[PDB]
Amino acid sequence: EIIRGEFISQPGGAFENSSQIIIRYMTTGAITIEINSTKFSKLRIPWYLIFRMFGMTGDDSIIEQVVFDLESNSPVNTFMIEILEKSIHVLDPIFQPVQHEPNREKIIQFLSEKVNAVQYLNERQLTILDKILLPHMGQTADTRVRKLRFLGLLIHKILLVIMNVFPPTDRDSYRTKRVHGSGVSLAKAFKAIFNTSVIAPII
Amino acid sequence: IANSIELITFERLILQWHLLYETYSSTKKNVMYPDFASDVEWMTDFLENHPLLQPPEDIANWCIRLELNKTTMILKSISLESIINSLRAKHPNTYIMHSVENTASGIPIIIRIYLRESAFRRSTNTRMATDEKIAVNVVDKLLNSTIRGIPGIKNANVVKLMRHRVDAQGKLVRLDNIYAIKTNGTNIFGAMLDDNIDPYTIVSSSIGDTMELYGIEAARQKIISEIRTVMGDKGPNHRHLLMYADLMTRTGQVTSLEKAGLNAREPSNVLLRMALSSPVQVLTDAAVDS
């Protein structure tokens, strides 16, 4: 790997569940997003697939979301495109058959296996993804464009770090840390046992 | 001498290089990239000034354009003639255009290398790799080419040394005016092959290089010296360093103080090696080996 951009998204208060959306950058030039949740837990889904799943067909717009522009001649803007263009042609080992499928439905189907009956499969997996991807933005599934724009923001920040525009996030700094009391710690084990004690009589 | 010794790769002198995928020839008047279309002025001139050298017509339609840093060339005291001679001698596979002759500041020094079919045709051997990708291998090879200096020496700084020497009177006198070069990498062979350096006194901090070039005894002395250096001011007695070196050079080859090293010095000692680490693997190998 080159670097890893990790973003744990939690909606509402600390007692809601969290989604650890990782954004890696492979040495070969591939950009993969790992949901690292209940579903797609170990699936390194290339970013452009994630963009098309939600309904982003045009590749030019897909690049735009990351770069927020497609005509400015900023050296930062330019270099970003070459990094991103090579990403499209990475030929990933997994998702290769689905790698260049214009049909939105086909892209969704391939994941379902890796996890109008097709509409149900799409209506299932896409809603699942909406619930799993960036919950803090919302889960109505009508804000998908906003989720994609924020994803592009993340790609832009990570790529800027690649180019050395900015330094990597400082771990020790307390600006990005938080101190949780007993309630947060208790709620953790409570979810496991309380559900466990509730599932046991379900059988 | 130190300036001469230091490795000067070609990439150090480039300001910006480009890959254009173009062919140069008076036939068909092949178009060029608009920014570099202005090169036509000295493109044809080079042939007029150097008629003996002309395009072999083996052009692979892959070309390199390289602007040179005049400031670096002046600083390093290297002339374009040496650069082109080294590039051509070490890369017969391509045709080199000296292009811009040395000028006053304002006229950039430019170089245009055209790749011949010889290198590209070889692609079929290993794989059907596209000629585009074998081209970037070639540009990297050109960038890494050594214009001057001993390979493997990043830096070289003159250092004041203190050394004794018996004078004519027969008195051992310490001399503090002696100067010497302290490099940043290790190449004993290169330093040996390069005059202006006393080949018989080359000293390296590398144990492997010393072993390879000089022998096991030199490697032993090098181990002693390096451990003593690592010890610092509060170092142990010398006999302990001697113990370390003698054990590590017992078999005629430098052996480690690790599982691999022990297995080479005391292979039959199954129990000792079991105690060190990996008891189950050692026991299995001992049992199968009997």
Partner: protein
């Protein structure tokens, strides 16, 4: 501040190999150093005959000169990894108490106070940074040493002296003679060889006995000369591969 003005006007010209930032940092670090005359006011105030702290330091019983200088005169520049306090609070800041791009030495770890005088808050923070660095280094050093200690012990375990005074591993020689001298490490004392550095004429004047005109004394002096030459040749060679 003079160096700071030089930087402000752009008069800082780094030498080859150093960037302007590194050259400026080195120049400021050299500028901020006690003149070694700081000891004069300390010694003027204290009475060597009846000052307990000074007597403890000077006899070597405990303490050092930098200790006295810090206690009485001033702590001076804090140096971590032989460098000032690198900006880490923010992009340009070193602490919340200083502007983003501050030229003052106080912002990069210079303490103008003394322990007896009482440090201010930022000086205290810098001192604690230095202390935590030292403690961390000690702990990591010990932790790293232990593992290599065990590996070396098992590597060298089987080297035992034998009845020939050699060192061997189950009859397989590791040394023809322990330490090449066959001596215990705790039965040695440093001694000086006079003839090593003497000149030819000095050696003849000092050691050639001329009381009796006999060849035996010439032979003895020749033996001394041979030994001197052997010592020089061997240990001059040690210089040439060190």
């Amino acid at each position: 501040e003079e160096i700071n003005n030089r930087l402000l006007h752009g008069d800082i010209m780094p030498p080859i190999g150093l960037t302007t930032h590194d050259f400026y940092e080195k120049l400021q670090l050299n500028a901020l150093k006690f003149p070694d005359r700081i000891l004069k006011p300390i010694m003027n105030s204290i009475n060597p005959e009846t000052n307990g702290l000074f007597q403890m330091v000077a006899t070597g019983a405990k303490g050092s000169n930098p200790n006295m200088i810090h206690i009485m005169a001033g702590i001076g520049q804090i140096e971590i990894n032989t460098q000032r306090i690198q900006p880490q609070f923010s992009f340009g800041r070193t602490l919340v108490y200083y502007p983003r791009f501050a030229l003052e030495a106080q912002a990069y770890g210079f303490i103008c106070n003394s322990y007896i005088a009482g440090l201010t808050s930022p000086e205290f923070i810098f001192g604690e940074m230095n202390g935590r660095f030292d403690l961390i280094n000690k702990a990591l050093s010990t932790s790293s040493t232990g593992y290599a200690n065990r590996k070396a012990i098992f590597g060298l375990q089987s080297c035992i002296v034998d009845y020939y005074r050699r060192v061997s591993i189950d009859t397989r020689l590791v040394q023809q003679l322990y330490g090449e001298d066959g001596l215990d490490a705790r039965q040695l004392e440093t001694v000086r060889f006079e003839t090593i550095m003497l000149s030819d004429q000095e050696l003849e004047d000092k050691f050639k006995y001329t009381g009796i005109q006999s060849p035996l004394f010439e032979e003895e002096f020749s033996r001394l000369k041979k030994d001197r030459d052997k010592y020089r040749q061997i240990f001059l060679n040690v210089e040439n591969f060190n």
